[PDB]
Design a protein around this ligand. Structure first.
Ligand SMILES: CCCc1sc(-c2ccc(OC)c(OCCF)c2)nc1CSc1nc(N)cc(N)n1
Ligand SMILES: CCCc1sc(-c2ccc(OC)c(OCCF)c2)nc1CSc1nc(N)cc(N)n1
Ligand SMILES: O=c1ccn([C@@H]2O[C@H](COP(=O)(O)OP(=O)(O)O)[C@@H](O)[C@H]2O)c(=O)[nH]1
Ligand SMILES: O=c1ccn([C@@H]2O[C@H](COP(=O)(O)OP(=O)(O)O)[C@@H](O)[C@H]2O)c(=O)[nH]1
Lengths: 234, 232
């Protein structure tokens, strides 16, 4: 609650997070966005951006070799970009809100978790990652800890179509069944609420859930109405 | 007020033996063993993780070097914190002796592995980026007051690996020891090597010749440490 509110936008690949955050950011000078490091890698530029494309391209080619390296770097860059904007942006605001394109928790409990369950990380890779994940996200008092979560809910089919509409040459190859396992794990943690995390407060952190199957680029008012209503109870 | 002194040197050159001798000499003197050495042997998940990843590292360094280097250093950083925030309370003249450092992690072993092609440019540039920042947020109060360099030849070292009897190590060739030997000379003797940590340019170094056996004859090495600490 102090002082900038921190909300994560969560949803499957191409569910629409980046459209929706670009939408939200224009609606209030009190609202700003921290976009996904991985989402920018997918496109001279900087060191991380250089590294990102490489590990991203290698992740696509042989994920059982690169998942640990990709995951730990994706998480670091996220922690870096969020911490930066936390003090950086929104210095003068009555009601400041930082929207995150995904969280350190999706990094682990959706993406890293699935890669493990899918045999792209062996047990020692998953234990090392989790250990590294703990120690560090436990070094941050209550600073990146979220006040809420906006789950952008979709079908894997909507997500499959919106990948080809997006037209990322490497992403075209992502299968429907992959989207499904990620989808199932999103529903699990956010909607059904099965998944237990190693972070205590998460079971109590408010969750707003939004079906986004219908194109919203021209018709977002009801969505944004649900954003504003949710933010006034936190 | 706690003084931080890193003890550096090649494998088997005698570092653990040294700090073990030193810790017994003063209530005010404490020690942080290097985690890789802890794994180089019930216990914890770190031991389990480090046990497994060291074995992997021995079988296929080209696959496991990045992961291993990330984990060796995170485990060290943490180990050094728990000493600094829970040991030497609240002595008159505290000195904590780290067995190696995050600098020897990066500028000796990780660099050496990249030169020997066990990491590619991506891995090494990811590691350094990781290293420049993991130290920044979490590892600031770990800044070194001084460094002690235990200097022994690669042959001395091969003999000592033989003496120590770790069978996992009994296949480490002379050649490898010879590599790590150069890395230390350029950093700690010739003082050539440049780093991104600028305080590490000033840092006082003391060099000690440990080619002769010292388990029953260390009094003159300890005098130089005591002298070196007073200059600080
Ligand atoms: C969508 C771009 C990033 C990629 S690429 C990828 C992938 C690519 C090829 C694959 O098989 C050939 C693959 O299968 C993994 C094994 F099932 C995953 N998964 C992913 C998702 S893992 C991930 N972790 C994060 N922490 C963040 C994030 N955005 N994505
Ligand atoms: C003492 C056991 C740790 C090992 S194992 C190892 C190694 C073993 C077998 C190898 O070839 C098959 C090998 O080859 C490297 C490429 F020539 C390295 N190097 C090392 C040194 S890497 C290291 N990094 C650290 N950061 C710390 C530390 N103590 N050691
Ligand atoms: O209502 C929508 C939402 C998204 N998109 C498109 O779907 C693709 C994927 O959306 P986005 O990149 O925002 O998904 P993310 O991966 O960020 O969740 C993009 O080309 C969007 O332009 C669309 O046509 N209509
Ligand atoms: O002066 C010495 C130094 C070392 N050693 C032996 O060399 C082996 C390796 O030394 P240590 O474990 O201290 O080396 P490190 O790897 O820590 O530098 C040990 O079994 C010691 O008993 C010795 O006998 N005399």
């Amino acid at each position: 609650g102090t002082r900038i509110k921190k909300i994560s936008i969560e949803g499957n690949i191409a569910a629409g997070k980046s459209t929706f955050v670009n939408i939200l950011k224009q609606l209030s000078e009190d609202w700003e966005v921290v976009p996904e490091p991985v989402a920018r890698w997918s496109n001279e530029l900087t060191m991380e951006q250089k590294n990102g494309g490489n590990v991203l391209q290698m992740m696509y080619e042989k994920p059982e070799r690169w998942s640990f390296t990709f995951q730990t770097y994706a998480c670091l860059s996220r922690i870096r970009a969020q911490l930066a904007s936390l003090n950086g942006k929104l210095k003068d605001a009555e009601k400041p809100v930082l929207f995150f394109e995904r969280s350190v928790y999706s990094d682990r409990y959706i993406f890293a978790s699935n890669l493990y369950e899918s045999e792209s990380m062996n047990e020692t890779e998953w234990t090392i990652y989790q250990d590294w994940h703990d120690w560090m996200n436990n070094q941050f008092g209550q600073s990146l800890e979220l006040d809420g979560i906006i789950y952008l809910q979709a079908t894997p089919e909507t997500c499959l179509h919106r990948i080809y509409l997006r037209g990322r040459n490497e992403e075209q190859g992502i299968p429907l069944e992959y989207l499904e396992k990620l989808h199932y794990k999103h529903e699990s943690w956010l909607l059904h609420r099965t998944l237990k995390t190693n972070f205590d407060y998460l079971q109590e952190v408010p969750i707003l859930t939004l079906d986004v199957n219908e194109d919203f680029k021209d018709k977002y008012e009801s969505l944004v109405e649900k954003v504003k209503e949710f933010l006034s109870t936190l």
